[PDB]
Ligand binder design. Structure first.
Ligand SMILES: [Ca+2]
Ligand SMILES: [Ca+2]
Ligand SMILES: [Ca+2]
Ligand SMILES: [Zn+2]
Ligand SMILES: [Zn+2]
Length: 169
């Protein structure tokens, strides 16, 4: 595992999230599930908790965008960059943007939302790119057909617990 410079991390244990908009690619409740599922992955191995907001600014703002959206890093059309997120902090920090020029799916027939979400939210919680090929933080998005087999790798667990520790009890 690897962490950002000056090891940015949330100084609080309870974080809020907000799904700013929805993609035409999927039913709305499939986006919610993917996100809440992605949150569970991290929540389970740390004392971190999450709650949802539908107004105001949440710690982690989630949205779907195309090309040039609200920042200095415009998306790039089909394929390649799938999504991007900011390390812990105020404002756009912790925020996660997803490229809609991809076909987001609940399965592996295009770009699986849950898988990329899990990855991006890694970045939101302070994790950088791992060198371990079997890790979720590894920069390689494979069309991991076997979602049925997915398991957070010990490397990812090590890295997130380095910042927030194991669950309370
Ligand atoms: Ca934020
Ligand atoms: Ca792209
Ligand atoms: Ca699309
Ligand atoms: Zn962006
Ligand atoms: Zn990444």
């Amino acid at each position: 595992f690897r962490t950002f410079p000056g090891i940015p991390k949330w100084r609080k244990t309870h974080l809020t999230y907000r799904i700013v908009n929805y993609t035409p690619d999927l039913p709305k409740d499939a986006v919610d599930s993917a996100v809440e599922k992605a949150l569970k992955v991290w929540e389970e191995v740390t004392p971190l908790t999450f709650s949802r907001l539908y107004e105001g600014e949440a710690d982690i703002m989630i949205s779907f965008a195309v090309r040039e959206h609200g920042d200095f890093y415009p998306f790039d059309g089909p394929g390649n960059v799938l999504a991007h997120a900011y390390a812990p902090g105020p404002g756009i920090n912790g925020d996660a943007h997803f490229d809609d020029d991809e076909q987001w799916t609940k399965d592996t027939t295009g770009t699986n939302l849950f898988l990329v979400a899990a990855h991006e939210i890694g970045h939101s919680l302070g994790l950088f790119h791992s060198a371990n090929t079997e890790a979720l933080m590894y920069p390689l998005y494979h069309s991991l057909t076997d979602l049925t087999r997915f398991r957070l790798s010990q490397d990812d667990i090590n890295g997130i617990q380095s910042l927030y520790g194991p669950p309370p009890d």
